[PDB]
């Protein structure tokens with residue numbers, strides 16, 4: 001009966017607001033594996049790219065194992081959530097028939113690996129503490145470079161190469177697209193990415209017409225970035241859980257900062273934090289500007305998502321006075 005309940009919950013895989021935490025429990029802590037498998041089957045990707053089912057499952061479980069079990073936010077559930085959110089965004093009416101199967105594969109694969117092996121601390125923390133990762137990556141997109149390297153490295157494990165039947169050309173193209181997409185999840189690039197998305201909205205032609213790698217990849221970069229920053233646009237019961245989790249990570253990082261004699265980063269001081277004010281600020285300065293721009297690109301497909309974001313912003317704001 002546990003499998004029956006899991007199957008019922010997975011019927012909502014094409015809908016914004018999937019019960020991803022329930023699926024995490026019902027699947028025996030395999031939300032990334034079951035959601036990826038479900039989406040690959042729904043989009044017929046196993047047949048299109050000749051991916052053996054056993055290879056897909058082996059790779060997925062291996063990848064999922066490299067998400068940390070003890071980080072409240074940047075874990076396998078976040079990976080699963082970004083994957084599923086990207087999957088829904090890819091299906092928007094305004095983008096019907098716009099992307100190739102390889103581009104679709106790249107966006108979903110990038111979403112799955114996008115935060116793999118995340119230590120639960122920020123790039124700035126890693127840079128300020130002279131960490132091994134920051135030393136390896138010269139303080140530039142430190143985590144994002146690492147997520148990519150691990151995600152790709154795991155394809156080399158026994159029976160894990162899900163791209164074994166792609167042509168060399170397809171493999172080269174996919175690799176480039178995935179790198180471009182995950183590097184675009186680095187928050188230091190948000191303002192530039194948003195500025196470029198706004199330029200695309202202002203010069204859009206129409207279903208959207210996008211025929212040059214530059215425009216197509218920029219839309220996919222922004223799409224996955226929106227998925228990554230989708231928690232405040234989800235039904236409130238989901239959003240509040242994501243907030244609880246990221247705040248826990250923030251506070252744990254702030255505890256490490258305090259212990260080292262460092263200045264505590266914004267929102268990371270458990271003795272001087274306002275979770276509610278931080279959410280309203282995050283939505284006002286980052287999430288709403290981004291999602292409103294995405295909504296404009298695909299107008300009016302994303303109106304319900306934007307409306308939810310706005311209702312959630314109002315809800316958090318109402319708790320402050």
Ligand SMILES: Nc1ncnc2c1ncn2[C@@H]1O[C@H](COP(=O)(O)O)[C@@H](O)[C@H]1O
Nearest residue numbers: 115187228229231232242243246279282
């Ligand atoms: N609910 C939230 N409240 C505040 N910041 C968030 C929230 N969700 C995502 N973020 C920020 O956006 C970034 C997304 O990149 P990542 O953490 O690597 O998934 C996080 O590092 C947070 O700083």
Ligand SMILES: [Mg+2]
Nearest residue numbers: 114115143185
């Ligand atoms: Mg990230």
Ligand SMILES: [Zn+2]
Nearest residue numbers: 078114115228
């Ligand atoms: Zn992320």
